[PDB]
Amino acid sequence: TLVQRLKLILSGGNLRCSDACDPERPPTRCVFQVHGQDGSNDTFPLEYVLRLMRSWAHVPCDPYVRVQNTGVSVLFQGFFFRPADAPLAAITAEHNNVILASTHSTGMSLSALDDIKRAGGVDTRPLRAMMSVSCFVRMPRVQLSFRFMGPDDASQTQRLLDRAEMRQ
Amino acid sequence: GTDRYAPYFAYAAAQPSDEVTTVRGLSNPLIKTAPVTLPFDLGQAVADNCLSLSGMGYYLGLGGCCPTCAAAEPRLGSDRAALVLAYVQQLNSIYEYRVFLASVAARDPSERALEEVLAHPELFFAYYVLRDGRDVRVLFFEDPDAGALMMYVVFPEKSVHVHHRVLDRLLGACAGHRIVAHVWQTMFVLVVRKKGDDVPAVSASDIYCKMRDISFDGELLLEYKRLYAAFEDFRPPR
Ligand SMILES: [Cl-]
Ligand SMILES: [Zn+2]
């Protein structure tokens, strides 16, 4: 169900996705696995999928996505809760580069993301400033950059939010 | 707390055609350029990052939004398969590359010095990459924090711009060498030294024989002598 939405979100890019979640009781285990083969330069919508996971759950949670260098491809492991010992990128909004050596991993949780967003004076208004992962697979390393992306036309985004507000 | 995203996600589940356009629509990056400080490790720069050094400061910008990168884009728009094979094939023939050899000739014109230079082919690869994307000067010195030698890539102008594709090639060709941007006596310099491969068996005696036949530019050899004198008390950190 969430995999169906995730494949649709990633349909624009060339990132492979691997094929149940209870909204009342969310699992602690890995929810999704996004793969990115060598040579690729695709972007992962981190903030979007993390906030989608928060809306999916009816019980309070803190969604987390782990990014790993498998030594062949990029791995994006999805979670509703950050597992104990899982890494978090010490990045700021201006300084967002993370280089991953083979078998090394980083990660990002919605709460840690919100702290970064607020500390960088970034706009909190919905879909105006969204963090996305730009990854470049330069073997043996995986190059990551946690950049904040805005829309090309904000007037279009504000009108889309009104359409969502109208149907309520 | 905040639940401002809740009305949108309810709508996004019902409207999939809008969800695709919203995700794809988030393309404009908020931070197009960020300030950096020297000494700066180039290994911190991703594939689309460009480096800019000037009196205006030091900046690590996005190539896709950079005007200096855009101008050079049709010229170097070049595959890695032929690029890796290019500097490997060009390592065999070092005659045209007067700038590289003149540095060896001016400092120590012995075959033992040429033996040590050719022992680290990644340094020629660094020079070859930086030459393409132009009038650089190389300096070979002994690494005091490693019997290996380090190279200083001295830039000619007071303003410096390393293309995103150029530093992508530079870091790739020099995997096993650390590249750090420095400033010394108003001169921007890149220090290429060993941190911790398909390369031809370089005949040091054959190139040494060719060096005797080659007639260098006198003004370039004296320039190197002055440059080596200037970079003696440099002391780059580890
Ligand atoms: Cl250095
Ligand atoms: Zn540029």
Looking at CA atoms only, how far is residue A127 from chain B in angstroms?
8
Q: At what resolution in Å was this solved?
A: 2.9
The residue ranges of every structural domain in chain A are 2-21+28-150
All residues of chain A having their beta carbon less than 8 Å from the beta carbon of residue B16 are 8
- Sort out which chain A residues have CB atoms less than 8 A from B48's CB and list them: 41, 134, 136
CA angle B121, B204, B209 (to 5 degrees): 130
Nearest to A49 by CA among A99, A109, A137, A90: A109
Whether the link from the prior residue into A140 is cis, omega within 30° of 0, is yes
DSSP string, B157-197: SSSEEE-HHHHHHHHHHTTTEEEEEEEETTEEEEEEEE---
Taking only residues 50 to 69 of chain A, the set having a beta carbon closer than 8 angstroms to any beta carbon of chain B reads: 51-52, 54-55
Q: Are B50 and B68 in contact (CB under 8 A)?
A: yes
Helix, coil or strand: residue B120: coil
The secondary structure of chain B in percent helix, strand, coil, rounded to multiples of 5, reads 45, 20, 35
B4 touches chain A (CB under 8 A): yes
Nearest partner of B212 among B79, B101, B130, judged by Cα: B101
For residue B216, count other CB atoms closer than 10 A to its CB.
15
Beta bridge partners of A141: A138
Contact B56/A at CB under 8 A: no
Chain breaks in chain A (C to N over 2.5 A) after: 19
Taking the Cβ of residue A1 and every Cβ of chain B, the question of whether any pair is shorter than 8 Å is answered with no
Let me know how many helices (H) and strands (E) chain B has, helices first: 10, 10
Q: Supply A105's token pair.
A: 């991993």
Q: How far is CA A162 from CA A156, A159, B10, B11, in A?
A: 10, 5, 13, 11
Q: Which chain A residues have a beta carbon less than 8 Å from that of B28?
A: 149-152
Q: Which residues of B touch A95 (CB under 8 A)?
A: 34
Q: What are phi and psi for residue A18, nearest 5 degrees?
A: -95, 135
Taking alpha carbons only, the member of B37, B68, B163, B47 closest to residue A145 is B47
Cis peptide leading into residue B39 (ω within 30°)? yes
- The token duo for B47 is 């594939």
φ, ψ of residue B59 in degrees (nearest 5): -140, 140
**Helix B122-132 vs helix B98-107: crossing angle, to nearest 10:** 130
Q: Which residues contact B50 (CB under 8 A, 6 or more apart)?
A: B60, B61, B62, B63, B66, B68, B69, B161, B162, B163, B164, B167
CB environment B12-38: b (16+ within 10 A), e (fewer): beebeebbeebbbbbeebbbebbebee
**A167 strand-pairing partners:** none
Which experiment gave this structure? Answer: X-ray
Distance B131 CA to ligand 2 centre (A): 17
Tell me, in angstroms, the distance from the centre of ligand 2 to residue B145's CA: 33
Chain A nearest C-alpha distance from B105 (Å) = 36
| B203 inside 8 A of chain A by CB | no
Contact A127 B45 (CB under 8 A): no
How far lies A117's CA from each of A143, B28, B164, in Å? 21, 17, 27
H/E element, B125: helix B122-132
